[PDB]
């Protein structure tokens with residue numbers, strides 16, 4: 535149960551759809567890590583995603599709609615439901631990409647955290663959700679910088695104690 539998403543100084547993530555910043559290093563590493571695994575995505579995501587479903591990977595959709603049909607990915611509407619699936623898949627890992635409400639649900643049921651804090655300060659209508667930082671301990675931290683001062687990101691890891 536790990537979360538993977540991009541954000542700015544304001545903690546942003548998207549602009550009424552998704553990350554509007556061109557982060558090639560994020561995508562490349564994103565797919566390089568989500569290879570042969572399972573990624574959970576929100577409703578607005580599957581519809582507001584540029585790569586739906588993601589190639590060479592296992593996609594997972596999370597929408598309230600009961601009659602929702604997501605071809606190529608797994609469909610569910612409850613937090614407990616999808617959890618049963620993840621259990622049935624002991625050969626894969628859980629990776630949350632979006633949306634904001636999705637991270638919230640697992641926010642409590644989460645174990646690992648992976649965030650990319652950009653350097654530039656952007657403004658939108660979608661910010662990250664609160665998390666129990668105390669209950670989570672930083673596993674790793676790497677500050678990556680590019681030619682552009684705004685293209686500088688920081689990769690941080692977090693794992694719940696015990």
Ligand SMILES: NC(=O)C1=CN([C@@H]2O[C@H](COP(=O)(O)OP(=O)(O)OC[C@H]3O[C@@H](n4cnc5c(N)ncnc54)[C@H](OP(=O)(O)O)[C@@H]3O)[C@@H](O)[C@H]2O)C=CC1
Pocket residue numbers: 538539540541546547548549550551552553575576577578579580582596597598610611612613631632633634635636639660
């Ligand atoms: N930087 C990034 O990687 C990403 C950034 N973003 C940004 O964040 C914004 C929000 O994410 P987006 O993908 O659009 O949002 P989603 O609608 O996909 O995710 C949140 C919504 O999913 C539904 N949902 C969440 N948890 C559950 C649950 N346990 N059971 C059932 N339904 C659930 C709810 O639907 P509702 O309440 O609609 O009924 C909730 O409002 C995007 O518009 C974009 O700007 C989005 C994706 C990735």
